[PDB]
Ligand binder design. Sequence first.
Ligand code: NAD
Ligand code: NAD
Ligand code: NAD
Ligand code: NAD
Ligand code: NAD
Ligand code: NAD
Lengths: 277, 277, 277, 277, 277, 277
Amino acid sequence: TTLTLSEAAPLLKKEFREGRLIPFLGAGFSKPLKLPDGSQLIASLAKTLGFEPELFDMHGRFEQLAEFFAISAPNRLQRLVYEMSLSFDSAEAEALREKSPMHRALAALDWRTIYTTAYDKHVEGALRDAGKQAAVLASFADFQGPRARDVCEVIKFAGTLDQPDTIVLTESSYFQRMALDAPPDQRLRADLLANSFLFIGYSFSDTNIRYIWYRMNQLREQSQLGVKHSQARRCFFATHGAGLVQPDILQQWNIDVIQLDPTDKSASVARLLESIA
Amino acid sequence: TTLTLSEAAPLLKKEFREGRLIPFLGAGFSKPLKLPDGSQLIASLAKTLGFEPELFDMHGRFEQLAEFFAISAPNRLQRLVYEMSLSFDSAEAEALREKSPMHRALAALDWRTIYTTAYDKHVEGALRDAGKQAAVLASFADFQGPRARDVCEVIKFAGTLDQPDTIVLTESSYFQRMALDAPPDQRLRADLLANSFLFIGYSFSDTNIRYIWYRMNQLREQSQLGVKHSQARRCFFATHGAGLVQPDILQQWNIDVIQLDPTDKSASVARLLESIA
Amino acid sequence: TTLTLSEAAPLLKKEFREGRLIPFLGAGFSKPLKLPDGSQLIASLAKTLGFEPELFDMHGRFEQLAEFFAISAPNRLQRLVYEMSLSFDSAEAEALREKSPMHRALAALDWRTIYTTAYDKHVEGALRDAGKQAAVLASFADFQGPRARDVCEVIKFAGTLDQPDTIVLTESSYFQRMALDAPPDQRLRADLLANSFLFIGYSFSDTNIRYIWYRMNQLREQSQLGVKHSQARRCFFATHGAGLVQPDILQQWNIDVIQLDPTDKSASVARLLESIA
Amino acid sequence: TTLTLSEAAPLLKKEFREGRLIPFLGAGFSKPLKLPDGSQLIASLAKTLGFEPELFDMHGRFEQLAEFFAISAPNRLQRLVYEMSLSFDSAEAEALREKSPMHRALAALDWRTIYTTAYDKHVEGALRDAGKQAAVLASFADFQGPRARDVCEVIKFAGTLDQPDTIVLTESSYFQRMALDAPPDQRLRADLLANSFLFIGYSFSDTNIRYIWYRMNQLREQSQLGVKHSQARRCFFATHGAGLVQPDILQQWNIDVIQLDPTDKSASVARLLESIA
Amino acid sequence: TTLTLSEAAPLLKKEFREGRLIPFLGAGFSKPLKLPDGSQLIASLAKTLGFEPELFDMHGRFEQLAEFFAISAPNRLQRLVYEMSLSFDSAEAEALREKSPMHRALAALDWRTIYTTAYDKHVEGALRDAGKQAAVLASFADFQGPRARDVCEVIKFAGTLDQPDTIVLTESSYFQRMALDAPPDQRLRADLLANSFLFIGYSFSDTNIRYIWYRMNQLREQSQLGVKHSQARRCFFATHGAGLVQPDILQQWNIDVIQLDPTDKSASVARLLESIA
Amino acid sequence: TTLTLSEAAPLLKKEFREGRLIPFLGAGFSKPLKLPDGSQLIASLAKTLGFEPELFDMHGRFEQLAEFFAISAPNRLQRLVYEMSLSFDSAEAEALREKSPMHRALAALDWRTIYTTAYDKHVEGALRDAGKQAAVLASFADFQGPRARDVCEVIKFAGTLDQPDTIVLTESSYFQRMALDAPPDQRLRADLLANSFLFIGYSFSDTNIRYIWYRMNQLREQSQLGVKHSQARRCFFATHGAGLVQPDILQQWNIDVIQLDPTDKSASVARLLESIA
Ligand SMILES: NC(=O)c1ccc[n+]([C@@H]2O[C@H](COP(=O)([O-])OP(=O)(O)OC[C@H]3O[C@@H](n4cnc5c(N)ncnc54)[C@H](O)[C@@H]3O)[C@@H](O)[C@H]2O)c1
Ligand SMILES: NC(=O)c1ccc[n+]([C@@H]2O[C@H](COP(=O)([O-])OP(=O)(O)OC[C@H]3O[C@@H](n4cnc5c(N)ncnc54)[C@H](O)[C@@H]3O)[C@@H](O)[C@H]2O)c1
Ligand SMILES: NC(=O)c1ccc[n+]([C@@H]2O[C@H](COP(=O)([O-])OP(=O)(O)OC[C@H]3O[C@@H](n4cnc5c(N)ncnc54)[C@H](O)[C@@H]3O)[C@@H](O)[C@H]2O)c1
Ligand SMILES: NC(=O)c1ccc[n+]([C@@H]2O[C@H](COP(=O)([O-])OP(=O)(O)OC[C@H]3O[C@@H](n4cnc5c(N)ncnc54)[C@H](O)[C@@H]3O)[C@@H](O)[C@H]2O)c1
Ligand SMILES: NC(=O)c1ccc[n+]([C@@H]2O[C@H](COP(=O)([O-])OP(=O)(O)OC[C@H]3O[C@@H](n4cnc5c(N)ncnc54)[C@H](O)[C@@H]3O)[C@@H](O)[C@H]2O)c1
Ligand SMILES: NC(=O)c1ccc[n+]([C@@H]2O[C@H](COP(=O)([O-])OP(=O)(O)OC[C@H]3O[C@@H](n4cnc5c(N)ncnc54)[C@H](O)[C@@H]3O)[C@@H](O)[C@H]2O)c1
């Protein structure tokens, strides 16, 4: 009911040599860089607001606790972006990034489009370390702006720290993205029409991602394909700790789960990216 | 930062005598009828699937565990509706409903529209007990069908057990309601343009409700009213156990919190409905 | 294939005594007040821009010629609203309005909601002449504002001249209303769920009206009613000069055509409104 | 106020050598193939229905007369598609297509994406004549299906005759495309984020095209770019017979008009496509 | 044991002047129009699928190889119908149809019902060439629709290319016709109760035809007629190349074989149709 | 795309220990008994009729050549049954049946129902050799007659040689079985509702078998199960020489193909039946 690493490796080679595989990277892809995930940000937001980190986490979801932080005082969200910039894109986080085996194995492949939901320059920065060049596309002016003819376009689906208006962190920013009208939303839905995705380091907890794959399956069911042909194009979801309910919800949406070895989380991902090559 | 019962009582009399107050009832309004809430359904779904109820609750949200139940076997969702009808609308639940002080105090007021998110006939059934007559509107055929000129219209926002196609319980049904195209969705958004709502027994955990009050705030901010006039029309949120984060999120959306006495949850609501009269 | 006046008269009495009939008034309802229709505005916009009125009408539709007028010079649209106010709501147009037999026959009936697409105060002003009182609702602040317990609400679907931001006349304003997010758009779609409409003086040329009745039939077809029950609730379209193609397009959308006598257009409408009483 | 052929020629070379120019072809691109345009179809639909062709055109727009044709009898639309196949993609229309100077000059350039609103195989068929290979993408199964690594993708925006469910010809089919949910609609809106378009043989009469460029300007105005940077990325609209109103409406939407010589309409387009090379 | 042309000619005159003779035309009736039979379609289906035409034929019957073609890819059957319409009903196939001596001799007789198992308009199109008018009946809507008082009804037993839902080509479509519930199946079984049939250009290889004549003989045997009276009403089977087994199987079913001259297959059929006149 | 012996072995153990696996045996199961298949009968029918065996086969299918044999002379079919008895159920065919490894491995399993389409007592006779007892059910009197409480019922789907009226060999006998009214037809369709079948030694060439699995899938599709649940119950088709078209036709009908080793056809089947134990 769940693919292993050796079973999913020839399925990822076929989609990559056709140029129809696109990585979708999450917050967990920057964990060997000693960066906070969605839980240690809330531990840092509770320290500023005067909460205890265990008591503050019981007052709502991740989207709702950041909305409470941004309206506690004026210019409180701007300060967070400044602090995050100092800690996510620091010089010691760049030094851990050349010697990271995942970021070397990601940049060794010749991708054309990479989607990320992280606030750091460590995905396109891994491409600059391997001699390649990337193109960060986060806002409307980036898509309209000039780029080289053949460059891996890194689509910042959540925003970038150098453009603080594009960051979706609070609940009102996620509700603004429910209309699927943003330029990262329009680019994702057109690439999902024709390409397989590889989810690495991302867990389907945001309802803005789960709603896009819902309405792609709707176009699939109304097109009245057979049992054989509607199950042909799959997506892949590499996760060390997938439960029992969530892999069966995603079988509806043509998303296969790749079970990685949870003992060393960094080396299990690196062996997946080297098996595509 | 939170209204009490005596403070919010003259604010509810003014909106009621103008005919601009509409109750929004949740699952907690049927708790003195000894009915399961959203937690004891999951304890019953885990018993059928072979899970332990504490282990099954850690694999996702309420929307996602019901989606996992409905796809475990064919005709598994239909059986649940049949079982729910035997336990929610039973004869012993009707007998506890005439002697319930909340259902007597609700039907004593001359309402015109009541919104509910519960799967039981105990809100309109309380109106039949007081000699009044109600009109259940859940599907498109109910809105098109005939009704008395002046009858309290009970809008089943989540569906009714006698029309099992209207029930939104699984995650795919909540994503179908995100487009705000259903007849309960279109009727709610037009009544929110001109009326105050009174939330009783409902906790803002569903993202389909929180997204409607978000977009209402959009129409409000783009209309460029002042500080005084954009804060004039309020909504009221009676809750025994509101935390510290959630009342401040709802101040953005013109929703005031009424703190009820948590010692006796049944009598605190009944004193609120008698203070409107 | 088309109802006459005597055939449609008992069908309009039944929906009116149930309180489920709502008039939809167009620009043609103000033609006995000697006001310009959509053709004499274009003859006045061409005189300002330096065009001949016959040459200016061949360069695009009514929506597109007003968009060209509004961007010819700064503050050009505001001047038009000021001029329209001087000519539509003048004192000699009010004097022709008490002695108009259509406006007397409209105000003699006890309506609850009237939708209008004409930029003038001659529909609610006819209600003030008969001793009744009305409530103009055009913007978001009007729906939020205070009204009396029971007062016929006149919904300005196109806007009002005393609130020039609500006027939809140019093409960019009609494209802004395609999202169906405006408060007149949300109120219309919820009243269409449960009520019959009577189109008087309006011709279905705007694609914002034809798109609403399209998506109400979609909810009707997906609900899988029978042949008998999906054709039960009709709408009525009184028109002196309906062609051969347009009455058959509207049979899809449960809209019946009432053929009025084209010799005297003012008296044919007045006999329809007196036959409802 | 309007570019000529020699002025717009270096502006089209710059966008083509960067790979950011995409042709948008209309019904007028197949006029040297002696095929009917939108006016001679209506002359053929009126002959079947028993109308005179001059009387039938005065009963509504092109979208509305085809809706009237499709509901006159059962299986009346299927017959039209079959008849159109016999006349549009006939053998004598293919023989006029190798010796056509526009189709030779179109296939001489190394495009990557071509959008067409025509139901015929003479745009991708021109690419097969020049030794190149194309990929017709019209339905959801085409985007999901296999293609080669690098092949010019011809996006049938209106549908193809070999898949009669994808054809948008009647008014109900254009209203179904207003939601912008179709796979040609989602692919167009993502390519418009980053590319210049070249409109050849198409006149902006369909409100489904004019609404897409409206909402791309919304993203542009809300992003708060300057006067210089919001006017940087243009689109080009080659037309022999543009009027006086329509070129100024499209300056709002960053669409420049290229005036071609109306004496020989076939040779004026061919000199434009050879000036890009 | 087999009738010749001169022997069967007075037997066909007697059934024709009584109005009790009905032609049953097959795929071989369109062979002078240079159209593919059931063998050259399989040679064209093997070219698309990548098979060699000699290796593809050894993998199953004609019904089974078309079922394999239709499920190889989505929208693969709708592509075939479009391609067939370009080649069967082309303009050069119509030009060979006026000068064909069989189609002239068929239309010279005053028939009332013609059954055909070919997908093309060259049987009713031969009737339009002789000044007569025909009525194609293929689907349920054709039988319900209006026709003139007296017009030869051409029953498309296999379907027509302008209604692609009626085409029976794949194996699942032949199994759907085994229930004998289709409107061409119900019309054939009632005409077989009272009329002689003339099989021209058809070989009894489909098990849906052989099963109808089986169950008409079952009615004959249970009615307990004598040896003389059960053999009175015959059917006629004109074939150039009937073997040794198949003419004796059909003597059970009151089907006589007319041996035509196999040197010129076109002129042998034309002398049969002129001998009926 | 095709299961091997080791892959299909745990899938057959699960259905057997639940008691939901039923063998379907063909003519090829008696080939190590040196019995004629469907090709050497035709070589024996051609010798009686005076044909050459290579010329006789080109005159029709297996069903049609036996129909020609039975009507060549009176009492010609009765003689064939008598001759077949002398050769199929002879004493030297029984002596090869105890030492046959397939018949030992078939009788070692504790079956409850076995379907056969062969004319010999070597399937139930293998059960008598292993000490077990069987019950031959071929006609209506066998189903009505007495059997023991628990005895493997051998359903002769084609008939038995000791009841010559039940033998379906000629074409008129197969057309009599198309109505699915025979007691072997009614018993098969009810066991197919709830059980997996294992096809051994049978090739899907008879259209009476392929039509039953067609109409079981029709019930499956009208019941509107999902993609996961409609593919749950499979059937298994062990064949040494399956082609390229026929395994893909049967994927529609939930029939999986087990590829056996074609070098030794007797030992490959015996290793399959021993892998179930
Ligand atoms: N600048 C950043 O990197 C950053 C940091 C915190 C939050 N955020 C934003 O807030 C959102 C919430 O973050 P989240 O982490 O809670 O959810 P998430 O879905 O983005 O990350 C969780 C996933 O990371 C994976 N993961 C954890 N450790 C890993 C490892 N060592 N190697 C590979 N994968 C590993 C988990 O298995 C899990 O599937 C994020 O999606 C992001 O938009 C960004
Ligand atoms: N037929 C039913 O009544 C029923 C039962 C379970 C679930 N559901 C559906 O599933 C959803 C989840 O149910 P949920 O209960 O978890 O969410 P909920 O928001 O509807 O109910 C929680 C609210 O009930 C209030 N409440 C609890 N006890 C109360 C009392 N004695 N008096 C007054 N209020 C009380 C809580 O304070 C809390 O605010 C529901 O919204 C519903 O759509 C319906
Ligand atoms: N302040 C105004 O009254 C005014 C004036 C011009 C335009 N407009 C706006 O521009 C839009 C276009 O105006 P339009 O008139 O071209 O379209 P319209 O559809 O609103 O009016 C046309 C309809 O008026 C009817 N009509 C004409 N004369 C009539 C009469 N004597 N009695 C009853 N009905 C009569 C026609 O039969 C026709 O059905 C309008 O809908 C409006 O929004 C408003
Ligand atoms: N199979 C087809 O080609 C076909 C034919 C008719 C209609 N249609 C469909 O119906 C729609 C309406 O068709 P339409 O023609 O009225 O609108 P259109 O906008 O598609 O075509 C009109 C444009 O063609 C241009 N044009 C005319 N002659 C030309 C020439 N010789 N060279 C270059 N350009 C020329 C006109 O200047 C004008 O700008 C079409 O968009 C299409 O979807 C398709
Ligand atoms: N549009 C078409 O005409 C067409 C083409 C191919 C297949 N099909 C369909 O597929 C089925 C299989 O086609 P098939 O041809 O193999 O079977 P068939 O039974 O329809 O045709 C065989 C018959 O054609 C006759 N025939 C051959 N040449 C002839 C000639 N020159 N004059 C008169 N008769 C001639 C043969 O004697 C033979 O009896 C067809 O029945 C049809 O339903 C239709
Ligand atoms: N008394 C008999 O056994 C007998 C003999 C001849 C014909 N018949 C009847 O006429 C029909 C036609 O017979 P048919 O054989 O041509 O069709 P069939 O489908 O019954 O047999 C073909 C199958 O036999 C299998 N087979 C061949 N050799 C085998 C072996 N050594 N081990 C296992 N399987 C083997 C083939 O793989 C093939 O799948 C039969 O179905 C039957 O009803 C019965």
